[PDB]
Amino acid sequence: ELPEDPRWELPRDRLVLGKPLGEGAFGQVVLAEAIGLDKDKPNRVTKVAVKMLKSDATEKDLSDLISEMEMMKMIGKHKNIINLLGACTQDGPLYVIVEYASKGNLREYLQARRPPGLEFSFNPSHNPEEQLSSKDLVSCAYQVARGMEYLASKKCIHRDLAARNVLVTEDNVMKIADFGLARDIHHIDYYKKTTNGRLPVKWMAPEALFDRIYTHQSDVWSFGVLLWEIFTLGGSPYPGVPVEELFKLLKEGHRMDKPSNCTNELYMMMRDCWHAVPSQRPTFKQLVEDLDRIVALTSNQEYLDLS
Amino acid sequence: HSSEKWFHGKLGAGRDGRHIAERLLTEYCIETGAPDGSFLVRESETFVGDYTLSFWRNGKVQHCRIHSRQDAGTPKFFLTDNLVFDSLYDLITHYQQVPLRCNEFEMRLSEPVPQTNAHESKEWYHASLTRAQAEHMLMRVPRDGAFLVRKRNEPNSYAISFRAEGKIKHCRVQQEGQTVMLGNSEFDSLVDLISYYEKHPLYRKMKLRYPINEEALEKIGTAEPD
Ligand SMILES: Nc1ncnc2c1ncn2[C@@H]1O[C@H](COP(=O)(O)OP(=O)(O)CP(=O)(O)O)[C@@H](O)[C@H]1O
Ligand SMILES: [Mg+2]
């Protein structure tokens, strides 16, 4: 029993757990039904997702989940950020209740939209209407940029931006999730990892890797990797390269190659995000604006020019 | 905040929002002999999160992007870099009095446009369903309040099929130009009519609470009685 919050705390019995949706080393998300989430609609059932610790969770993991929950309350609502619905903190396991993304994580979303290939066809010839276009891909990068831009304006670093952490809703809206590694840097303008532990190395910028220095600049690096993930439709960053050799590769100025079927500007965008000088990488405000233009230009949909 | 009006929101459940808005403004203005400046504000398809102002101008429907920015803590809306508002309302309001300066010429938005296609994406609405075909669906749902709205062959007319007192009962709706009539009652569109009776009683205090469709049956529907 820790500090309850009348603002988010929800009666533990107004939540009916369902099947798993995704797991990890020590943590799990399960679908569920929330009765009367809104006080003015006590009987309306809302499909939701609930995050919780596994059976073998440690003390440390619990504090990470507490933190994760506090971070989501401090960050606020945004079109492209998974929104926090409530929580169960008293007399029992901590439940962080969040919005349900019916199409899963971005990695899975993209892979299920990959082509059959020439001379090959799909069985049972699945939805040919959901096969994504070049316009739809830029739109996904744009949406994530908009969400990161908002997150940066709130003086926060995610530190775990990857396609597996971007959820896709029913209407295909990108929602940045998994704030368990996020940190507030309102006054300091950086975070320095003191302790040790698990880290998504293939998505981390050199300085965060070697010097343990985190900023919006390292998030932008991760975003470069995310872009690669998007344009390869769910590929794995630095495929086949052992992590222990990744260190050597980065220290020597190695960058991933251009994903086939990807304009040169988008590849240049990835390069900028991977700039060796952190201060030289674009900020999220620049990425949104660039991506804004490309979306306007890729979707041949004409609008009124007021200038 | 936005309370319907010219504000249509999501069109086609996220599918073909521009196209759906063009046919909605074209056939509507062509017929009603609408003046230039007729408009509606919809969600943007190209720029997710932003809005779009679609309007009628010289036999042609044109779209204008409404930028939104939620960084200054307060939301911001604008069409140009020299003018900004705290809400879609103050923004739409403004461009009703003051024109829209572009490449061609200027233009003050004139009058709103109702949601004439709003029902075409709803769960309860069916375009081609026979009465028996409808009764069979409501027969598989042993409840009171379950319903749907089918379109009939007769021009400008729809029926409302529902389960009152454990028995199938139908209701007649007639399209009169640009208004829907439920007998003596009159509304702006099917969706405004269903919206109403989703709260108020439609028959013996029986209210439209449970839209019915194929998937709705996969949640309630068994095999049919008689
Ligand atoms: N709201 C949601 N809707 C649908 N699926 C979700 C979801 N939230 C999470 N998932 C699924 O669970 C996966 C992992 O979720 P999340 O990233 O929040 O936990 P995590 O990766 O931190 C577990 P660990 O901390 O052990 O590594 C997502 O990639 C997705 O597959
Ligand atoms: Mg994760």
Describe the 3D structure.
The complex is a heterodimer of chains A (307) and B (226). Chain A has 307 residues and is of the alpha+beta class. Chain A is 32% helix and 16% strand. In chain A, strands 1-2-3-5-4 form a five-stranded antiparallel beta sheet, covered by helices on one side. A two-stranded antiparallel ribbon of chain A has the order 6-9. A two-stranded antiparallel sheet of chain A has the order 7-8. Chain B has 226 residues and is of the alpha+beta class. Chain B has two domains: 1-116, 2-Layer Sandwich (SHC Adaptor Protein); 117-226, SHC Adaptor Protein, CATH 3.30.505. Chain B has helices spanning 17-32, 88-97, 131-139, 190-197, 214-217, and strands at 7-9, 39-43, 51-56, 61-69, 76-80, 83-85, 125-126, 146-151, 157-164, 167-176, 179-182, 185-187, 210-211. Chain B is elongated and about 65 Å long. Chain B starts with 6 loop residues before the first strand and ends in a 9-residue tail after the last helix. The chains are: A alpha+beta (307), B alpha+beta (226). Chains A and B meet through helix 3 and helix 8 of A and strand 4 of B. The structure holds phosphomethylphosphonic acid adenylate ester and magnesium ion (MG). Phosphomethylphosphonic acid adenylate ester is lined by residues 21-22, 24-27, 29, 49, 51, 98, 100-101, 104-105, 164-165, 167, 177-178, 180 of chain A. Chain A: It is found in: Cell membrane; Nucleus; Cytoplasm, Cytosol; Cytoplasmic vesicle. Chain A: Belongs to the protein kinase superfamily. Tyr protein kinase family. Fibroblast growth factor receptor subfamily. Chain A: The active site is at residue 160. Chain A: Residues 1-307 are cytoplasmic.
